[PDB]
Amino acid sequence: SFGRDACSEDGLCQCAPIMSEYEIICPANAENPTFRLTIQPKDYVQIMCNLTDTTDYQQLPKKLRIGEVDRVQMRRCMLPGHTPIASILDYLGIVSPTTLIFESDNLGMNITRQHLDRLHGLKRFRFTTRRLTHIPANLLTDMRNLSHLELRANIEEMPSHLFDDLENLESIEFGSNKLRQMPRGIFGKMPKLKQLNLWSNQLHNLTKHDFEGATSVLGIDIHDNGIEQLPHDVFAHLTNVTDINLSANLFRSLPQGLFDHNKHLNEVRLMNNRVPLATLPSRLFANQPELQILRLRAELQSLPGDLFEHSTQITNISLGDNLLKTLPATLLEHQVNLLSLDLSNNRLTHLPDSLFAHTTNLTDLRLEDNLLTGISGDIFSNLGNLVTLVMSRNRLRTIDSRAFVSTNGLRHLHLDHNDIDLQQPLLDIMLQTQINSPFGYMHGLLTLNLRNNSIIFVYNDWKNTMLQLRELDLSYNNISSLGYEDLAFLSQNRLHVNMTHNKIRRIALPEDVLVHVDLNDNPLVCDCTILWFIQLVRGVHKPQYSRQFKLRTDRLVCSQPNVLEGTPVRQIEPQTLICPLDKCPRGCNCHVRTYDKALVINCHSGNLTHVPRLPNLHKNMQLMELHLENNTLLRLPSANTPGYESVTSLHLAGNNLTSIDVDQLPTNLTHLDISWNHLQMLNATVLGFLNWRSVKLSGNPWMCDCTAKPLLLFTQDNFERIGDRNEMMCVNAPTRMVELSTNDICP
Amino acid sequence: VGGSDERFLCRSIRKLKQAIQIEECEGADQPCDFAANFPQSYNPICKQHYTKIPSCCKCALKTGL
Amino acid sequence: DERFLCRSIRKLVYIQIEECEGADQPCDFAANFPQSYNPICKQHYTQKIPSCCKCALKTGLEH
Ligand SMILES: *[C@@H]1O[C@H](CO)[C@@H](O[C@@H]2O[C@H](CO)[C@@H](O[C@@H]3O[C@H](CO)[C@@H](O)[C@H](O[C@@H]4O[C@H](CO)[C@@H](O)[C@H](O[C@H]5O[C@H](CO)[C@@H](O)[C@H](O)[C@@H]5O)[C@@H]4O)[C@@H]3O)[C@H](O)[C@H]2NC(C)=O)[C@H](O)[C@H]1NC(C)=O
Ligand SMILES: *[C@@H]1O[C@H](CO)[C@@H](O[C@@H]2O[C@H](CO)[C@@H](O[C@@H]3O[C@H](CO)[C@@H](O)[C@H](O)[C@@H]3O)[C@H](O)[C@H]2NC(C)=O)[C@H](O)[C@H]1NC(C)=O
Ligand SMILES: *[C@@H]1O[C@H](CO)[C@@H](O[C@@H]2O[C@H](CO)[C@@H](O)[C@H](O)[C@H]2NC(C)=O)[C@H](O)[C@H]1NC(C)=O
Ligand SMILES: *[C@@H]1O[C@H](CO)[C@@H](O[C@@H]2O[C@H](CO)[C@@H](O)[C@H](O)[C@H]2NC(C)=O)[C@H](O)[C@H]1NC(C)=O
Ligand SMILES: *[C@@H]1O[C@H](CO)[C@@H](O[C@@H]2O[C@H](CO)[C@@H](O)[C@H](O)[C@H]2NC(C)=O)[C@H](O)[C@H]1NC(C)=O
Numbered sequence: 001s002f003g004r005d006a007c008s009e010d011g012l013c014q015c016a017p018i019m020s021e022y023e024i025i026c027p028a029n030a031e032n033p034t035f036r037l038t039i040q041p042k043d044y045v046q047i048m049c050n051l052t053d054t055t056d057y058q059q060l061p062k063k064l065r066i067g068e069v070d071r072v073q074m075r076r077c078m079l080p081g082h083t084p085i086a087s088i089l090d091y092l093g094i095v096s097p098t099t100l101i102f103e104s105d106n107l108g109m110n111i112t113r114q115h116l117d118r119l120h121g122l123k124r125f126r127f128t129t130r131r132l133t134h135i136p137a138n139l140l141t142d143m144r145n146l147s148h149l150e151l152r153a154n155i156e157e158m159p160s161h162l163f164d165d166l167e168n169l170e171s172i173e174f175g176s177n178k179l180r181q182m183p184r185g186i187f188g189k190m191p192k193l194k195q196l197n198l199w200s201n202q203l204h205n206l207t208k209h210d211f212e213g214a215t216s217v218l219g220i221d222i223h224d225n226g227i228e229q230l231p232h233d234v235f236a237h238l239t240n241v242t243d244i245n246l247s248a249n250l251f252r253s254l255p256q257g258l259f260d261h262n263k264h265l266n267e268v269r270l271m272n273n274r275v276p277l278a279t280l281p282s283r284l285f286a287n288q289p290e291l292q293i294l295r296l297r298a299e300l301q302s303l304p305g306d307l308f309e310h311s312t313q314i315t316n317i318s319l320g321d322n323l324l325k326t327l328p329a330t331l332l333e334h335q336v337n338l339l340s341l342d343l344s345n346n347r348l349t350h351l352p353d354s355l356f357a358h359t360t361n362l363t364d365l366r367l368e369d370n371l372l373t374g375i376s377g378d379i380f381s382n383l384g385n386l387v388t389l390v391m392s393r394n395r396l397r398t399i400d401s402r403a404f405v406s407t408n409g410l411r412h413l414h415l416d417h418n419d420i421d422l423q424q425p426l427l428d429i430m431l432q433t434q435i436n437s438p439f440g441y442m443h444g445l446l447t448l449n450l451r452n453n454s455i456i457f458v459y460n461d462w463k464n465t466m467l468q469l470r471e472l473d474l475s476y477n478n479i480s481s482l483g484y485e486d487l488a489f490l491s492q493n494r495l496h497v498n499m500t501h502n503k504i505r506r507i508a509l510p511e512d513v514l515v516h517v518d519l520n521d522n523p524l525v526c527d528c529t530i531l532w533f534i535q536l537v538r539g540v541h542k543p544q545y546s547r548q549f550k551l552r553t554d555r556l557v558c559s560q561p562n563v564l565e566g567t568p569v570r571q572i573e574p575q576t577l578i579c580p581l582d583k584c585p586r587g588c589n590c591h592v593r594t595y596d597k598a599l600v601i602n603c604h605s606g607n608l609t610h611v612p613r614l615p616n617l618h619k620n621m622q623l624m625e626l627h628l629e630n631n632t633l634l635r636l637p638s639a640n641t642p643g644y645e646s647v648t649s650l651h652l653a654g655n656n657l658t659s660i661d662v663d664q665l666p667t668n669l670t671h672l673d674i675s676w677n678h679l680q681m682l683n684a685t686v687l688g689f690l691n692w693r694s695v696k697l698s699g700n701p702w703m704c705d706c707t708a709k710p711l712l713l714f715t716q717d718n719f720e721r722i723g724d725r726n727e728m729m730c731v732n733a734p735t736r737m738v739e740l741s742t743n744d745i746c747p
Numbered sequence: 748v749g750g751s752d753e754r755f756l757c758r759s760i761r762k763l764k765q766a767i768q769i770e771e772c773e774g775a776d777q778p779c780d781f782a783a784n785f786p787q788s789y790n791p792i793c794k795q796h797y798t799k800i801p802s803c804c805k806c807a808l809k810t811g812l
Numbered sequence: 813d814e815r816f817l818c819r820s821i822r823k824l825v826y827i828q829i830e831e832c833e834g835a836d837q838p839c840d841f842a843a844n845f846p847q848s849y850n851p852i853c854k855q856h857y858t859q860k861i862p863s864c865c866k867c868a869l870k871t872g873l874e875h
């Protein structure tokens with residue numbers, strides 16, 4: 001009827017096919033156009049107006065031919081004077097609409113029956129306006145096909161003779177009007193009426209008489225209606241009612257037997273009561289053969305055990321957001337088919353161990369945001385079907401061992417934000433004791449969430465018994481140290497463990513022969529103890545197990561020492577990782593880097609004539625760096641001096657040594673920086689000893705004569721060993737020694 | 748099907764080298780529709796969302812995520 | 813300090829795009845709505861760029 005072809009055509013109003021529809025704009029060049037038709041052929045057509053006087057309808061597109069359409073929607077339109085709206089629909093070429101929606105705040109007048117001539121065939125009509133406007137009761141005349149009605153014009157009261165020809169009306173929507181009273185004698189004219197939405201009115205004092213003849217009615221909504229209290233028979237004529245809604249009201253109490261005559265109930269909802277409703281009367285939902293869904297939120301303080309007595313059909317219950325301190329034990333005795341209890345946000349401190357005794361089919365339980373304090377052993381000993389469970393943000397401290405033995409149906413377990421520690425003594429931990437958390441029996445478990453607790457150990461069961469585990473959250477606990485066994489998760493199922501923000505101050509990884517583990521934000525100390533970890537962090541170390549887990553470490557930062565502090569783990573270099581040796585000589589700071597097994601001794605005080613007593617080298621260590629730079633030594637100790645005897649490196653630059661015996665040098669020596677000393681001559685026995693040995697020799701008063709001849713040949717060939725050959729000087733005038741021959745010195 | 752109309756909480760106006768289809772809040776900070784059952788605290792208000800350029804208009808409750 | 817009836821996930825790929833999570837699935841607080849209305853989250857577009865994800869209270873002409 002109307003497609004892309006008509007769209008392209010000029011110059012009337014411009015059309016432009018967008019998405020799958022067409023956005024016609026009249027006029028074609030107007031900023032704020034008079035009309036903005038939006039046509040989606042066969043389906044609907046929205047007419048968006050912007051009119052001053054009613055005479056603007058001329059600028060409508062001429063000869064449009066939209067053909068058949070199910071839904072017509074008019075927004076911001078002038079009521080068309082003394083002209084049927086169906087005229088405008090004819091002008092645009094629309095044929096047989098099923099729905100007309102009139103929704104404006106610029107009407108120009110009041111709605112009249114004449115507007116609705118030729119739209120008697122309608123099935124759905126909606127009229128909405130926030131103007132002050134009166135609606136005539138002769139408006140819906142000859143509307144035999146109207147099945148859905150909705151009017152919203154701040155309607156203060158509606159006279160019965162409106163619904164005269166509405167014989168086929170099944171559903172009524174009059175929310176956000178001002179109805180102060182239910183129209184009498186109306187259900188007789190509408191024998192097929194099923195939905196009766198009367199929310200957001202003023203329907204205060206309703207009464208048993210107000211529903212006489214409404215045995216056709218299934219759903220009645222009266223929420224947001226200031227209702228302070230209801231007569232115990234208000235619904236007594238509503239015999240086959242299935243959906244009530246008493247929400248947003250003002251109940252302080254309810255009469256017993258309130259639903260006694262309506263044993264076809266399928267869902268009652270009393271949500272968000274604008275004032276505190278202490279409790280529900282006895283047997284309020286008892287003896288209800290079809291009752292399923294329920295929603296209660298009125299800041300309830302307590303409940304009767306017989307509240308759901310014999311109502312063995314209930315499937316969902318929302319008792320969330322109340323003030324329940326506890327529950328009676330029998331409350332769910334008969335609720336065999338219950339599927340989802342939800343006691344979120346209460347002051348629940350304990351739930352009688354027999355509460356979920358019979359609730360054999362229970363699947364989702366929610367208990368988060370209460371003052372629960374521990375899981376007993378019988379409380380869940382029947383919930384083999386319970387698939388996912390929440391107790392987040394309570395004060396759980398004591399999960400019984402026998403607690404989770406029968407819950408083989410569980411997959412998602414959230415006990416985050418509690419005070420659970422699993423009571424583990426730290427000494428069984430250090431001694432790698434194979435012991436299980438009470439979650440042990442749940443092999444097929446998928447989600448564990450112990451965030452913001454006080455776990456101090458990665459328990460045995462979560463690595464080897466839970467192979468299906470996909471989601472593990474141990475962030476914000478109190479784990480102080482990891483070992484390579486704390487990263488051994490036997491899960492072939494995309495496991496992502498979160499260990500952020502704990503107390504992990506060290507990570508003991510060894511050199512040895514798919515699970516993601518976040519380790520960001522930790523009090524890691526960066527001493528020699530965490531050596532292999534840093535190598536592993538970079539490409540360096542990859543000791544077998546490494547490839548079977550994938551560490552996230554991008555925000556792991558050294559807390560101590562103050563040198564490396566503030567710096568990430570991939571950045572640092574393993575020679576900084578030193579562990580202070582306390583034994584060490586006075587005036588000398590010492591440390592050990594396990595990067596090269598090197599015992600370093602820094603005695604850079606500047607006041608030593610002797611080499612101070614040196615601590616022995618471990619039979620594991622390999623390097624010993626006696627750093628005695630810029631002092632005033634005099635002589636060196638023997639090679640047999642203990643501690644000293646294991647030295648590999650001897651950094652004595654800037655000292656006072658005048659002669660070096662070949663016995664004053666250590667067996668394990670490999671470096672020998674005797675730069676800047678008092679040495680004038682080195683015997684030929686020393687030079688044989690220096691056969692790899694890096695050596696430094698410059699800055700000494702070298703007496704170059706015939707007795708220096710050996711040394712002069714040493715330098716001349718041992719180029720690699722001596723870093724400062726070109727800097728070695730003579731004192732017989734001074735000239736560089738590398739400017740000398742073995743004959744300038746030797747006749 | 749027939750009369751398969753869907754009702755949004757916030758009314759808005761979908762309008763248009765190349766033009767761009769946007770959606771813009773009919774009113775600024777108008778209360779949301781069907782918002783009678785949300786708690787007294789949530790105070791539902793209509794908000795304007797962008798993509799800078801308008802994209803759609805959503806109702807916005809005041810609570811936790 | 814806000815929550816919307818339909819959880820979505822805005823993005824930034826080449827233009828900023830908001831996108832439904834659970835489209836065609838019930839909205840949040842799907843019980844806080846008047847009775848004839850069925851809350852179901854809709855994926856809205858612009859220009860095919862997912863621009864928005866809002867809750868459409870849909871009224872069938874059946875009970
Ligand atoms: C009464 O209580 C019972 C039990 O507590 C409730 O039943 C449960 O209803 C749930 C409906 O949401 C249902 O959970 C589903 O399981 C399905 C798997 O079998 C999922 O597909 C389903 O949808 C998900 O929705 C997510 C957003 O919330 C989203 O991640 C995702 O959506 C994508 O997928 C859909 C296809 O399904 C796409 O169309 C979409 O575009 C997205 O890409 C995902 O699908 C949800 O996870 C439980 O299984 C039901 N419990 C059972 C069967 O035991 C009743 O609903 C309660 N009744 C009332 C009135 O409250
Ligand atoms: C495990 O849980 C922790 C909880 O602390 C998660 O930490 C957070 O991860 C997100 C990832 O995007 C970080 O957000 C980003 O931060 C960077 C740096 O400031 C910023 O540029 C990004 O725009 C984004 O905001 C967040 O900082 C980080 N920490 C906290 C305290 O939230 C972690 O991602 C979880 N890991 C896994 C694998 O589940
Ligand atoms: C719709 O009809 C009503 C009649 O009930 C009109 O009401 C008038 O309201 C004004 C206030 O602005 C009063 O001064 C008049 O006295 C009312 N009329 C009568 C007969 O009492 C209302 O104005 C009409 N709305 C239109 C035409 O848009
Ligand atoms: C609506 O409720 C009435 C309640 O009386 C149902 O009436 C049935 O038929 C006669 C009354 O004409 C009673 O004697 C029967 O006992 C009722 N049957 C029952 C209660 O099962 C009537 O059937 C209901 N309507 C619908 C559509 O269910
Ligand atoms: C789960 O719910 C089913 C119903 O779907 C229960 O089955 C019935 O349980 C009642 C309990 O008294 C018995 O009277 C019926 O004979 C049972 N019928 C059938 C067909 O099983 C079931 O008992 C519940 N529990 C479990 C573990 O499935």
Ligand SMILES: *[C@@H]1O[C@H](CO)[C@@H](O[C@@H]2O[C@H](CO)[C@@H](O)[C@H](O)[C@H]2NC(C)=O)[C@H](O)[C@H]1NC(C)=O
Nearest residue numbers: 392393394395416417418419451452453476501
């Ligand atoms: C960890 O959980 C605790 C509570 O389990 C949070 O601490 C606060 O607890 C008091 C009540 O005991 C309340 O003020 C709030 O529940 C919490 N304060 C807040 C949220 O500011 C604590 O905030 C949680 N921390 C983390 C990182 O999850």
Ligand SMILES: *[C@@H]1O[C@H](CO)[C@@H](O[C@@H]2O[C@H](CO)[C@@H](O)[C@H](O)[C@H]2NC(C)=O)[C@H](O)[C@H]1NC(C)=O
Nearest residue numbers: 608609631632633634654655656657676677678
């Ligand atoms: C160690 O050797 C240094 C040479 O670098 C000596 O320092 C000088 O000694 C002479 C002789 O007493 C003084 O005249 C200079 O003033 C000193 N210069 C300085 C201290 O910078 C130092 O005295 C020697 N020390 C020992 C204990 O032998």
Ligand SMILES: *[C@@H]1O[C@H](CO)[C@@H](O)[C@H](O)[C@H]1NC(C)=O
Nearest residue numbers: 031032033049050051076760
């Ligand atoms: C309608 O036109 C008027 C003209 O002043 C303008 O102010 C208004 O914004 C327009 N409305 C729409 C919805 O385009």
Ligand SMILES: *[C@@H]1O[C@H](CO)[C@@H](O)[C@H](O)[C@H]1NC(C)=O
Nearest residue numbers: 120121122142143144145146
């Ligand atoms: C109602 O619909 C019938 C078709 O079933 C049709 O004849 C006409 O459009 C309507 N009749 C009325 C409203 O009397």
Ligand SMILES: *[C@@H]1O[C@H](CO)[C@@H](O)[C@H](O)[C@H]1NC(C)=O
Nearest residue numbers: 203204205206226227228229
């Ligand atoms: C109807 O309810 C209102 C609520 O305050 C009350 O004041 C009034 O007395 C009630 N009317 C009858 C007849 O009970």
Ligand SMILES: *[C@@H]1O[C@H](CO)[C@@H](O)[C@H](O)[C@H]1NC(C)=O
Nearest residue numbers: 421454456477478479480503
């Ligand atoms: C946290 O770790 C410390 C380590 O000093 C330990 O003593 C304590 O028991 C753990 N738990 C709490 C709640 O402090």
Ligand SMILES: *[C@@H]1O[C@H](CO)[C@@H](O)[C@H](O)[C@H]1NC(C)=O
Nearest residue numbers: 586587588605606607608612
């Ligand atoms: C110099 O070395 C001696 C050796 O025992 C030590 O006592 C002294 O503290 C050192 N100097 C300084 C300034 O510490």
